[PDB]
Design a protein around this nucleic acid. Structure first.
Lengths: 150, 45, 72, 50
RNA sequence: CUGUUGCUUAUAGACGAUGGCAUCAGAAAUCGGUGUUGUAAGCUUUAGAGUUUCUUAAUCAAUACUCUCGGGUAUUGAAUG
RNA sequence: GUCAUCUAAUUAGUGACGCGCAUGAAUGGAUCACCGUGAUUCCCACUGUCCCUAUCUGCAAUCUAGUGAAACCACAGUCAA
RNA sequence: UGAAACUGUCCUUAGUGCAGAUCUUGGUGGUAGUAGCAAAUACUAAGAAGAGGAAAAAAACAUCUUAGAACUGAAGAGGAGAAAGGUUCCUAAACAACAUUACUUGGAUUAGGGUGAAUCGAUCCUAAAUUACAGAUGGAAAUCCUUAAGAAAAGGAUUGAAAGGGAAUAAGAUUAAUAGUUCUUAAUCAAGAGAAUGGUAACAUAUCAUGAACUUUAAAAUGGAGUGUGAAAAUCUACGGAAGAGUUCUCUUUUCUUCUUAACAAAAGUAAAUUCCACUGAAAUGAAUCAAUCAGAGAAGUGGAAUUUAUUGGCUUUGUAAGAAAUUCAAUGAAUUGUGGUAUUUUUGCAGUCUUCAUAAAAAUUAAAGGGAAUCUUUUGCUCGUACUAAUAACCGCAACAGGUCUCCAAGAAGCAAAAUCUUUAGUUAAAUAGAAUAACGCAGGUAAGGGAAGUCGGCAACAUAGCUCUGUAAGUUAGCAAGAAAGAGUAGCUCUGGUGAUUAUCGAAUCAGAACUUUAAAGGUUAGGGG
RNA sequence: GAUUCACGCAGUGUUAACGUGCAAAUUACUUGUCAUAUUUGAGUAUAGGGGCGAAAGACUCAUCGAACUAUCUAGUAGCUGG
């Protein structure tokens, strides 16, 4: 007897695909008598039909790869396949640095470390690509404050 | 898989009478795992 | 590709059933029946179509009310 | 199609109704030559052009 | 007598054919010989750049040393038994 | 065509000559930078294209079980004069 | 043999005698048990049913269950629709024919069953276009006109879209098959029935707080590119656990699975962006973005108002609502259902920038204004479509044809990449038959000593270069290019170091550079320019 | 109306396969291309001495240097076969 109907009905009740349905092979005459969804549900409750667990997929291998690449283990020249701009976009580095440097000058103006005329002059210097990073701007501001008092 | 099989396999075959008809017979080949095949000759279990 | 391949896109009807003659000859874009000559009041008949005349004409149907009158 | 007109569906239903065979009792009448319906068609054998 | 058939038969072969043996038949493993590749897996040389942690105590560490001329394969169209 | 040049060797290519069978100015004349699955010639590299063929795999082809067409067909099917 | 009509003679009459016409129609041979039944990686074992794996290996055995091994690889051989098909859908009985073997299988035969809507669509509106009465034209059939010609239609007639516009429904369960349609629960919409305050102002008040003719305004209703960013989902990840499963002679406080929530409404807490309002008046010019851009017809500052952000009001939260659902345990009954992220993608908005000799629809329908004419409960919600495929078997190609045919949802690894390659959820293992042998000649994929195009019409075919980083780069030129010119060097594994931020030491981003040591000396498994 | 890759598309070469084919034009690799002179669905408009054509006498339902269909029509043949 073909158990195609029971396999299809069980998959709709178990809410799984036909590949996850397990019909017990030693009671085919018992299973083949269930020609309705009400009868299938009883067979599921009686452990005649069970749902196979999903095949295991481990992320352990990927986790170790990221751990090694954090320490720069595989980030060499021979493992780089894209262009320099592709891996680290140049435009987004400008947007990141502009936000960082313009945030610092906004913090100093409200704190009173620099005045509006000094803040304005450094703003156009920041936009003009004068300081590589935060430290260079802090050094320039520190140096410019000492010329002011002299 | 389908592409590779073990180079040496050790099996155990047993002649037994068929359950349905006792006069007739059938073979039952089973698998006997071994650590190594060294010094293993045809043994009548 | 004028043969087998070009036939795959044929899924749009040109003619559908006509209300007056029952045949699938009603042109959807011309709004007229190729067979019985719809909305035109007179039925479409031609002398070169003598077989077409012997297929649909008087006496090819039930003659529900004319069969009694001529018998009378 | 899924969407169809009302009259078109009834002409589809009649085509279903006419795709039947001769009942057995009709075949046992005296002097009967009608055994099979030669106006039969199947969906995958002939399209009914409607 | 000859043929079929068997050895999933060879010195032969598209198929037939041809060649050999058929109960002292045949086959099979295992063993030794003979070849191929290059030193298995487990534990040990702190081998070991450094890091880390207890702070000489461990760790983790590509690769490297001894067991190891190792391990694996070997008729399938190889040779003995 | 003749002269140079490209090659060991050039009816090929390039550069010159021009009484040009029968070039020639929006039937457009001359000139090409970029571009072209366009036409042509030569170098480097590489290679079974070749000297000159060997060999490997899969699918068939071969044989068998089931199934099973077609083109074609006067009759047919050994040669010399 | 056959079983009911027929024959001879003479005249008369003719659809009167066949080997050919590539003659017409029908039937049948050789070919011939021959060519074939070879694209789409692939099946094996045990059992069940069945006349249908027997046997001197007759080496193969359709269907269903379990196990193993696999393929499509999520721009799929997944889950759903539009056109087209039309009962192909589901179930049972049954296999004569059909699916190039067979079939217990079937999209095949027989017989029943199946398609439920106030909220989804058609119905409604108009777009390109289309067709009427009267009129005009023509010998005629008929053509023209679509608001112009009319005693016709406050104003212009009919049709025209299941992808354009549009009143209103969601979650769970259920069937052999229908489900925003049935059931439970929870809502919504339409049509009904029972002459006001507050705020300086922007503007605000569970109906409120009257508003006719007439007129106006707005919405429906409007291109594309590219950049930044808010939010949700998915993936990834941090902390904290609960429950179950996998591995475990070698280790692994380990690997894996679940930890959810609708329409419609509420308003504890709290965002981003834009535009306006009040105070004050900028120069020593400020403010601001990735880019811009802005300002005395008024900047920045402070305090406010409004709108947008997939339903009320964007996110969390709440009613719904845990009673559902998911994961477990027990033999119907019990357990739990935290909080984050300066990561990626998709979707959805927003903000300004660019671009056009291109400026990227209309109506139905709705609201508001100017004006001043006048003095909570309950009922109903009609007609039609609704099954199924949507394709390496339901569509078009004569067919179960490697051809063609419009869309929606869309995981992990790796990488610049929605690339090649492998896997997860889902689907399938059959998709014109197999077994044995392992000849020639083939089709598809390859390799090769020495030479290196001598082959040939011709380097046809194949080989060869190939990613990224650094250096370097000619003539010529329309000065833009040539240019990835040409040419040269580096690249692996392991252990470390430094740079690039946020909050006041902790937290996070993959990216760049550098140094020792070791080795089989490193883009090349896949993908991947020959040059002059 | 820059250079390329990808989903797709086309059809440069092999003058490969096949050539009583998977197919009355297809398959494989190679090549070109792969968004603004782009690709594409449905609706709608254009008809045979006509239409449509970035122009090949190309396309107009496997039909094109004048479609398909029916009638005139048993068109005519000094030519061919019986």
């Amino acid at each position: 007897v073909s158990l195609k109907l029971q396999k299809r009905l069980a998959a709709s009740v178990l809410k799984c695909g036909n590949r996850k349905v397990w019909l017990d092979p030693n009671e085919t005459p018992e299973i083949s008598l269930a020609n309705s969804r009400k009868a299938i549900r009883k067979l599921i409750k009686d452990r005649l039909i069970i749902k196979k667990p999903a095949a295991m997929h481990s992320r352990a291998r990927v986790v170790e790869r990221k751990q090694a690449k954090i320490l720069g283990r595989h980030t060499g020249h021979g493992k780089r396949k894209g262009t320099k701009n592709a891996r680290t976009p140049q435009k987004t580095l400008w947007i990141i640095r502009m936000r960082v440097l313009r945030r610092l000058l906004l913090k100093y103006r409200t704190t009173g470390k620099i005045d509006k005329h000094m803040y304005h002059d450094f703003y156009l210097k920041v936009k003009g690509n004068q300081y590589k990073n935060k430290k260079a701007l802090m050094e320039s501001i520190f140096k410019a404050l000492e010329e002011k008092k002299l | 898989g389908i592409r590779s099989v073990a180079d040496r396999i050790r099996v155990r075959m047993a002649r037994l009478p068929i359950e349905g008809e006792e006069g007739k017979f059938y073979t039952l080949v089973s698998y006997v795992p071994v650590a190594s095949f060294k010094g293993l000759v045809t043994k009548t279990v | 590709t004028k043969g087998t391949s070009c036939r795959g896109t044929r899924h749009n009807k040109t003619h559908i059933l006509c209300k007056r003659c029952g045949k699938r000859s009603w042109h959807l874009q011309k709004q007229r029946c190729a067979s019985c000559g719809y909305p035109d009041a007179k039925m479409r008949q031609y002398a070169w179509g003598y077989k077409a005349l012997r297929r649909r004409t008087q006496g090819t149907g039930r003659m529900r009310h004319l069969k009694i009158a001529l018998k009378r | 199609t899924g969407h169809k007109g009302f009259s078109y569906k009834l002409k589809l239903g009649k085509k279903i109704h006419q795709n039947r065979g001769v009942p057995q009792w009709f075949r046992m009448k005296t002097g009967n030559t009608i055994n099979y319906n030669f106006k039969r068609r199947h969906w995958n054998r002939r399209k009914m052009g409607m």
